[PDB]
Amino acid sequence: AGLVPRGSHMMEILRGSPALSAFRINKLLARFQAANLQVHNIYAEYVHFADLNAPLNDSEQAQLTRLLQYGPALSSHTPAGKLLLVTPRPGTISPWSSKATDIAHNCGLQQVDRLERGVAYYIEASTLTAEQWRQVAAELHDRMMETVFSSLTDAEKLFIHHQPAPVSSVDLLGEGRQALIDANLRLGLALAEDEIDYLQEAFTKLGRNPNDIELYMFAQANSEHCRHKIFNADWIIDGKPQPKSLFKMIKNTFETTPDYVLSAYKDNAAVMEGSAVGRYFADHNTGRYDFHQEPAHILMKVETHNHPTAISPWPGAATGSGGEIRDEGATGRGAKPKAGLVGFSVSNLRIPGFEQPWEEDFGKPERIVTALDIMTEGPLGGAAFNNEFGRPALTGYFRTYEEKVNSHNGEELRGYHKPIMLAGGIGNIRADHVQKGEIVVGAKLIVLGGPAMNIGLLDFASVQRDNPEMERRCQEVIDRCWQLGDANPILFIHDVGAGGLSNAMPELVSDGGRGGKFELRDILSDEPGMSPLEIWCNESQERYVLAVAADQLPLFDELCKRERAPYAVIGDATEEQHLSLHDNHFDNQPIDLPLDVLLGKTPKMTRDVQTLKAKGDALNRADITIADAVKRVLHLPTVAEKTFLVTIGDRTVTGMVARDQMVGPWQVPVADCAVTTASLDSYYGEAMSIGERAPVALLDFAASARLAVGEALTNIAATQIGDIKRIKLSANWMAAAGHPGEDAGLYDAVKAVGEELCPQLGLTIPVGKDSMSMKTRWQEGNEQREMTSPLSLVISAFARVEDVRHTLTPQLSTEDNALLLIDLGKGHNALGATALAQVYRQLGDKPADVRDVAQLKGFYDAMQALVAARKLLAWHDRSDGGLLVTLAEMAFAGHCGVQVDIAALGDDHLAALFNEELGGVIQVRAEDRDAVEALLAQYGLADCVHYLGQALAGDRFVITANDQTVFSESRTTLRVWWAETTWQMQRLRDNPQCADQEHEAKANDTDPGLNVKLSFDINEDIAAPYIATGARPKVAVLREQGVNDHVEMAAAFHRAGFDAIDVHMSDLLGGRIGLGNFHALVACGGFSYGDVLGAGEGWAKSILFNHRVRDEFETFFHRPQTLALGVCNGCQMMSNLRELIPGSELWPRFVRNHSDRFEARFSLVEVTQSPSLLLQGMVGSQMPIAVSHGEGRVEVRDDAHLAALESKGLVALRYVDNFGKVTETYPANPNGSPNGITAVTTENGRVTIMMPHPERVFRTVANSWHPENWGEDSPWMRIFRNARKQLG
């Protein structure tokens, strides 16, 4: 390794591993070929850079080298051709750096000041002008985040230490108002004239110049984004002043329906009542996990991240999720996120080679990315945060829309060049923490979370950065705090978002009626160059602010240190309502303002506007046939199979997921809503649904809003809730404010829901948000061009659930059955702004709408009655794609056919099939048909209800009208058409061989779906005689920073009769726990250190390189009767500890999945013959299990080691396909493991490691699909019971 001076430090250069798999290499050479760059070869190697504050000895040096060996064992090559080194941009620090540096430090390498990584490309192309070489460089890096260098030694620039820049005053006293004008332009404050006036007066009054930092702070606080001027404005519309602001109209819903609401409009989340259940967590005093029977109340929030996603979609989506997760955690006095949702709206995908006939290239601004790039990288970013933080992503929407239409302002381009990137979620909260506490004078004011950098200030300022593992460490602290109940030391907590500390700290003291005084140099920073303005105002991620009483600081400090969550006390709350920021380094005072000056307002806005309303035009059906329409509609991404957005995101973490997107044996993503259990011990729960219908707003603003509320309801309706007043909404409003017609449209739509529909249904909207510049302008040759969004209301619905077991899905039964349409359209059959119109490049005439409020209410209540009485076999609502899609999706999910007659739905068959009016199809038992129709009739629905026919075994999808066949096709053929979008996305994003295997398996109708074979009685609690003695052996539930499934792991061992003890690696390191006291160990899953330096490696190496902790592990494993289990991240960890584990010499490594993608799957495995004591009695069983990993591929050293492993009989689980054979085809085998291997054991059988998560599926109710007759325990419960019985 290289070692040179880097200013006051030394920089070491260490060569790492080959970086690109063969299919990635081929993709690059293919891209070079298509651009006419004649490249003979390309090879890439990771390279690591260590900036050292003192030397390493030989032992330490060998440690560092070893830390930096990871990754798949790809073919290595001696370098050749021209070097192009890609690194993060100078002045930035990669999340990889943050995590890898933490590993070095936890391995005792304090000398390592910072680690960073690049990629060295070696390109052989002996032609190539220098012009072409810049094109080559351009293809190998992301211009928003990375730079390209010619030497390895250039990485020195990444570690330059700049001296702290001083505060700068803006010279109002010396130049007058011109100085504020100049600063406004120079610093991009975007101040209005009246804000310049207020600032000029405030500072004239104080008699001194404002500092740059004070102006910036004021500018961020008073932006549209932070102040919500539009939503608080007075309105005049068509000449008449209006009585309410938009905000007041939303609040009207709470004044009408306060029921169940605990908190609305006074926190960064709403809270509603949940259920009394067993809240499961480890006691502060014993470290033991125990159930605490108490209300688990339900918080909800939804946010957007639209602008940054247009610039840098991966971090834009990741931090959109990250911001939202902080809002949840900082609700009240601390709360716990549970499950998430995700939304995207983009322009047309225009997938190379898969152009669809409605798509036209209209151009875009150079400075934004394409719709395709957003849908490639954005969902990966959103999922990276949810996976590595550890909340399951259980529902979502994805719409594409880009067309030249005759809308409210005449002919123009309407679309989503600036996308919607939506993230939201639910969490749980204790009753006594729902209310923010008061801030005592002298309260310590703390920043919890990550060291700041210059983020948020070619738009580099919109390039965000995510570190989910940092946020997980913070959440653990928050959890520790709320888990102390009455001794929770958190007095007040708030997230840090827009404006950074300059917004969050003033907001916090002000919400408590206090001031604060702050010390700039107490704030944690990874960028010593930063000005006070940059420190105070940057939008660095994973930070929270809180207030704690001075006498609780020692407790807080203990809590943070055990979690490894960084924190700093940065000031004190004062009685005086003044804000002071001091700088110890420059000995001065960057901020010194009364709060009333800083937080004082300009006058509220008045919007005086007028109504525009499109006529819109009858659908021209010249080129439309029913058959062609079916093919086109199934190819609209809006309609099409969403797998590329679903399997990339964990859907099992917490162990509380009852209903995820994937439905049935064939795991078809058509679930209409998400459902979680409230605890690990209850069937009470929570549900999430989304409704949205933006294109309708191009014809009718209020109908678009009414339909978003309506579809939220129709998506959630087959979940057992009861009173509709249990359902609470978030309303997120996206608009191009100021665009002609949109303002009046916005007012009308908000009124349509806030003043009319929601009050009439009894639906509260206790939370919500707005994004008001949904348009993009650019110059496109000669001309000005503009792409403006429709008004885009996204409704998310949230509800307490009475029994999660009674949820229906779209999965049709083929037992004797009746299919009934509930047509809440009442025969209007509207076709305007449908998927059908869109796919023929039209807007059409009149859209759907809520036709009858009482009937919508009735529909809901009748569904609730049918659900509760168990009278439904299946449900699927009608939305994009109409009845045709509803029926098709039900057939896909049931893996069957339908025989339906539409003669009663009107003579216009096209309109009957493709209207997107509210309603849906219920399936009931044939014998229940008359009673079900009677029930519906007593809710006023008889004329909306139509018997369609039946679901039948087979492959025929048949629609008749009297004796005419309207449409007939192979259900498989439709299902594979419907799959083509996700196929093409997967194919261009992931390993094409895997995308293609997954796609091609859909075309095989003989696939029997997930199915089980059990070698034992699932219901026999073999641990019960032991549990009945009341002797409860301990299990060390072992977690490292970033681990996230430790709670449900504990619960599984607990159900089997153990006392589950929380053992953090910090507990082992500080002697608080010794393994000598345990007979059982389990290393849990998650993303320890964000998987940086190879999944499980930092965890393992921190054990190996500390000799004491290492001896402790080794001793545990060499005892004669100890048991250990490693699951997922713990399997990876323990595989890196072979040297401590007897009988583990043939164990493989676990590396990047062959798909090159995180795989969240419900996969079929079989239990194989091995010594594993944890699998006793189960050999020959086949059943599905939760899978949730990116690095699960078994990799051996060579074939000799694979054969040896196999011959020793150590393989304990294998992936099988649905025909029951061992497989390596994807995704049946989700990772590419040879011989399906996904668990191995030791020779003595006492240690077992496995990639899947049995702890996530020990409850039948948490199995995405399961046989109907199972009781409460899944087969996987037997693992934990086998461990108990084995201990005796």
Ligand X SMILES: Nc1ncnc2c1ncn2[C@@H]1O[C@H](COP(=O)(O)OP(=O)(O)O)[C@@H](O)[C@H]1O
- Give the interface with Mg ion as residue ranges (CB under 5 A): 672, 715, 877, 879-880
Cα–Cα distances in angstroms (integers) from residue 510 to residues 120, 503, 576, in the given order: 51, 11, 11
How far is C-alpha 166 from the geometric centre of its chain's CA atoms?
39
CB-CB contact of 278 with 1259 (8 Å): no
Rounded-to-integer distance, Cα 298 and Cα 427, Å: 6
Rounded-to-integer distance, Cα 1287 and Cα 1059, Å: 13
Report whether 395 belongs to an annotated binding site: yes
Residue 875 contact partner, candidates ligand X, Mg ion, none, CB within 5 to 8 A by sort of partner: none
Report whether 325 belongs to an annotated binding site: yes
Q: Token pair for residue 1157?
A: 């993608």
Rounded-to-integer distance, Cα 1149 and Cα 1172, Å: 19
Report whether 327 belongs to an annotated binding site: yes
What are residue 688's DSSP bridge partners? 674, 798
Q: How many CB atoms lie within 10 A of CB 917?
A: 26
Report whether 318 belongs to an annotated binding site: yes
CB-CB contact of 136 with 121 (8 Å): no
Is the CB of 671 or the CB of 902 nearer to ligand X? Answer: 671
Residue 645 contact partner, candidates ligand X, Mg ion, none, CB within 5 to 8 A by sort of partner: ligand X
Cα–Cα distances in angstroms (integers) from residue 421 to residues 17, 540, 696, in the given order: 35, 19, 20
Report whether 711 belongs to an annotated binding site: yes
Is the CB of 172 or the CB of 884 nearer to ligand X? Answer: 884
Q: Token pair for residue 669?
A: 């993503």
Cα–Cα distances in angstroms (integers) from residue 873 to residues 810, 894, 1156, in the given order: 9, 11, 38
Long-range contacts of 230-234 (CB under 8 A, 24+ apart): 230/605, 230/607, 230/737, 230/746, 230/770, 230/772, 231/770, 232/604, 232/605, 233/604, 233/605, 233/606, 233/607, 234/604, 234/605, 234/606, 234/607
| Residue 48 designated active-site | no
Report whether 322 belongs to an annotated binding site: yes
Is the CB of 476 or the CB of 877 nearer to ligand X? Answer: 877
Report whether 1045 belongs to an annotated binding site: no
Number of helical (H) and strand (E) elements in the chain, helices listed first = 39, 52
The distance of closest approach from Cβ of residue 877 to Mg ion in the complex, given in angstroms and rounded to an integer, is 4
Q: Which amino acid is at 812?
A: L
CB-CB contact of 534 with 526 (8 Å): no
The distance of closest approach from Cβ of residue 227 to ligand X in the complex, given in angstroms and rounded to an integer, is 30
| Active-site residue (options: 307, 944, 1255, 1266) | 1255
CB-CB contact of 250 with 768 (8 Å): yes
Residue 1090 contact partner, candidates Mg ion, ligand X, none, CB within 5 to 8 A by sort of partner: none
| Active-site residue (options: 635, 1064, 1154, 1253) | 1253
| Active-site residue (options: 474, 481, 1128, 1131) | 1128
| Burial track 410-443 (b if 16+ CB lie within 10 A, e otherwise) | eebbbbbbbbbbbbbbbbbbbbebbebbebeeeb
Helix (H) or strand (E) holding 1248: strand 1247-1250
Is the CB of 390 or the CB of 566 nearer to ligand X? Answer: 390
Report whether 715 belongs to an annotated binding site: yes
The distance of closest approach from Cβ of residue 387 to ligand X in the complex, given in angstroms and rounded to an integer, is 13
Rounded-to-integer distance, Cα 552 and Cα 565, Å: 17
Report whether 712 belongs to an annotated binding site: no
| Residue 944 designated active-site | no
Rounded-to-integer distance, Cα 688 and Cα 675, Å: 7
What are residue 276's DSSP bridge partners? 295
The CA-based angle 630-635-639, given to 5 degrees, is: 85
| Interacting residue ranges for ligand X, rule: CB under 6 A | 342-344, 393, 395-398, 642, 645-646, 661, 669-672, 715, 879-880
DSSP state of 1125: E
The distance of closest approach from Cβ of residue 645 to ligand X in the complex, given in angstroms and rounded to an integer, is 4
Residue 642 contact partner, candidates Mg ion, ligand X, none, CB within 5 to 8 A by sort of partner: ligand X
Rounded-to-integer distance, Cα 281 and Cα 264, Å: 27
| Residue 1064 designated active-site | no
The distance of closest approach from Cβ of residue 1127 to ligand X in the complex, given in angstroms and rounded to an integer, is 25
Is the CB of 397 or the CB of 1215 nearer to ligand X? Answer: 397
Residue 508 contact partner, candidates Mg ion, ligand X, none, CB within 5 to 8 A by sort of partner: none
Residue 86 contact partner, candidates ligand X, Mg ion, none, CB within 5 to 8 A by sort of partner: none
The position carrying tokens 């954005």 is: 378
Pairing status of strand 270-282 against strand 420-429: unpaired
Q: Token pair for residue 710?
A: 């309506």
The distance of closest approach from Cβ of residue 345 to ligand X in the complex, given in angstroms and rounded to an integer, is 10
The distance of closest approach from Cβ of residue 1196 to ligand X in the complex, given in angstroms and rounded to an integer, is 35
Is the CB of 113 or the CB of 849 nearer to Mg ion? Answer: 849
Report whether 316 belongs to an annotated binding site: yes
Is the CB of 230 or the CB of 645 nearer to ligand X? Answer: 645
Is the CB of 755 or the CB of 877 nearer to Mg ion? Answer: 877
The distance of closest approach from Cβ of residue 913 to Mg ion in the complex, given in angstroms and rounded to an integer, is 15
Q: How many CB atoms lie within 10 A of CB 201?
A: 11
The distance of closest approach from Cβ of residue 1039 to ligand X in the complex, given in angstroms and rounded to an integer, is 28
Report whether 321 belongs to an annotated binding site: yes
The distance of closest approach from Cβ of residue 1004 to ligand X in the complex, given in angstroms and rounded to an integer, is 22
Q: Token pair for residue 647?
A: 């399997």
Is the CB of 380 or the CB of 1239 nearer to ligand X? Answer: 380
Q: How many CB atoms lie within 10 A of CB 54?
A: 10
Residue 447 contact partner, candidates ligand X, Mg ion, none, CB within 5 to 8 A by sort of partner: none
The distance of closest approach from Cβ of residue 690 to Mg ion in the complex, given in angstroms and rounded to an integer, is 6
Q: What is the DSSP string of 816-834?
A: SEEEEEEETTTT----BTS
Residue 670 contact partner, candidates Mg ion, ligand X, none, CB within 5 to 8 A by sort of partner: ligand X
Rounded-to-integer distance, Cα 824 and Cα 863, Å: 13
Rounded-to-integer distance, Cα 128 and Cα 136, Å: 9
Residue nearest to Mg ion (CB): 672
Is the CB of 493 or the CB of 688 nearer to Mg ion? Answer: 688
Is the CB of 642 or the CB of 706 nearer to ligand X? Answer: 642
Spell out the residues 6+ positions from residue 101 whose beta carbon is closer than 8 angstroms to its own: 112, 113, 114, 115
Residue nearest to ligand X (CB): 396
Report whether 326 belongs to an annotated binding site: yes
Residue 342 contact partner, candidates ligand X, Mg ion, none, CB within 5 to 8 A by sort of partner: ligand X
Rounded-to-integer distance, Cα 506 and Cα 516, Å: 8
Residue 671 contact partner, candidates ligand X, Mg ion, none, CB within 5 to 8 A by sort of partner: ligand X
The CA-based angle 696-702-707, given to 5 degrees, is: 60
Positions at the binding site for ATP: 316-327, 395-397, 671, 879
Positions at the binding site for Mg(2+): 672, 711, 715, 877
Positions at the binding site: 316-327, 395-397, 671-672, 711, 715, 877, 879
Give the residue numbers marked as catalytic.
1128, 1253, 1255
